[PDB]
């Protein structure tokens, strides 16, 4: 509440608390962290990105988004923890410090702020945006089916009332197009990580196609390493693979898009658990989730700085 050291990372928070936290961190570490507004949500909420940088030009960067599906509360929670951890670990952990000395990290903690507020206000299990309009009484888009990556192919629904509605057209959702513009403008993203829950998967492209990416040996080996790393803290077991082979055909996804933009290190995380609590993960599992998931992200970041 009054500092990042006082903020309770072991509980779920509302939108206003997470936004206030962003200000606390920026005030506490003005030299390392910048808050960027890359857009406004459908219902006009600021869309915020935290930039961690040690200086430089337009340094190669890591993108990280969390909470694009609003009900996956473990992701926004992890996302606050990560932001603190970046400030803690800089100059303490030789490895994280070599990363920030050369690369920037862009972290979007609440990708889908309207959906998030709605999970607090009215429906805990809401996952879509809150865009209206058309020939429908149904609200919102699945923002992870809205990307220009096999948009409107099988693996996404053309029904507005669907939980997997893709939207009217690729990048209809302002929460998506804001990211698109942001990353295309920057032009120097090397990794792109989207954070989801649940089922304990690490996934690389594609969802939308059975085509093998050209980088599949490397991405596979990276995913293997990062899952090994993650499991080392608490024994938490992930599976890894391409989206389409591991789950099922899915179109308009984040990672397919970023990989098609030439961002090679494009991974999605589905965090704990495997279905005991599902989206309603106990607050007592926040910090352990955040701590292990860090070891997996770190591993990918290392690989990135290195290739
Ligand atoms: Zn999700």
Curated annotation (Swiss-Prot):
Expressing tissues: Pancreas.
Active site: 270
Catalysis: reaction(s): Release of a C-terminal amino acid, but little or no action with -Asp, -Glu, -Arg, -Lys or -Pro; leukotriene C4 + H2O = leukotriene F4 + glycine
EC number of this enzyme: 3.4.17.1
Note on how the cofactor is bound: Binds 1 zinc ion per subunit.
Residues reported in the UniProt entry to bind Zn(2+): 69, 72, 196
Binding site for substrate: 69-72, 127, 144-145, 197-198, 248
Regulation: Inhibited by interaction with the S.magnifica carboxypeptidase inhibitor SmCI.
Entry cofactors: Zn(2+)
One Gene Ontology term of the molecular function aspect: zinc ion binding
S-S bonds: 138-161
All residue ranges annotated as the Peptidase M14 domain in the record: 11-304
Recorded consequence of changing residue 179 to V: In allelic variant
Keywords of the record: Carboxypeptidase, Disulfide bond, Hydrolase, Metal-binding, Metalloprotease, Protease, Secreted, Signal, Zinc, Zymogen
Protein origin, superkingdom: Eukaryota
Localization (cell): Secreted
GO terms for biological process, alphabetical: leukotriene metabolic process; proteolysis
Assigned GO CC terms: extracellular space
Function comment: Carboxypeptidase that catalyzes the release of a C-terminal amino acid, but has little or no action with -Asp, -Glu, -Arg, -Lys or -Pro. Catalyzes the conversion of leukotriene C4 to leukotriene F4 via the hydrolysis of an amide bond.
Protein family (similarity comment): Belongs to the peptidase M14 family.
Self-association state and partner proteins as the record states: Monomer. May form a complex with proelastase 2.
Protein name: Carboxypeptidase A1
Boundaries of the shown chain within the full protein: 111 to 417 of 419
């Amino acid at each position: 509440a009054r500092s990042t050291n006082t903020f309770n990372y072991a509980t779920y928070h509302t939108l206003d608390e997470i936004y206030d936290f962003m200000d606390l961190l920026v005030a506490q570490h003005p030299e390392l962290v910048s808050k960027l507004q890359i857009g406004r949500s459908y219902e006009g909420r600021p869309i915020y990105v935290l930039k961690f940088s040690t200086g430089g030009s337009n340094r190669p960067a890591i993108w990280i988004d969390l909470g694009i599906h609003s009900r996956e509360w473990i992701t926004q929670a992890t996302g606050v923890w990560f932001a603190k951890k970046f400030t803690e670990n800089y100059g303490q952990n030789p490895s994280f410090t070599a990363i920030l000395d050369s690369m920037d990290i862009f972290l979007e903690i609440v990708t889908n702020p309207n959906g998030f507020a709605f999970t607090h206000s009215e429906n805990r299990l809401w996952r879509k945006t809150r865009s209206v309009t058309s020939s429908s009484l149904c609200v919102g888009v699945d923002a992870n089916r809205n990307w220009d990556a096999g948009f409107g192919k099988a693996g996404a629904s053309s029904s507005p009332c669907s939980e997997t509605y893709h939207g009217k057209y690729a990048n209809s959702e302002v929460e998506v197009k804001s990211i698109v513009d942001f990353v295309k403008n920057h032009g120097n993203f090397k990794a792109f990580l989207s954070i989801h829950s649940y089922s304990q998967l690490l996934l690389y492209p594609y969802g939308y196609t059975t085509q093998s990416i050209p980088d599949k040996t490397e991405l596979n080996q990276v995913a293997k390493s990062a899952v090994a790393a993650l499991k080392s803290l608490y024994g938490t077991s992930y599976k890894y693979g391409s989206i389409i082979t591991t789950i099922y055909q899915a179109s308009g996804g984040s990672i397919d898009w970023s990989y098609n933009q030439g961002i090679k290190y494009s991974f999605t995380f589905e965090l704990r658990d495997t279905g005991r609590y599902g989206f309603l993960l106990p607050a007592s599992q926040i910090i352990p989730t955040a701590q292990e998931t860090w070891l997996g992200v770190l591993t990918i970041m290392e690989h990135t700085v290195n290739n």
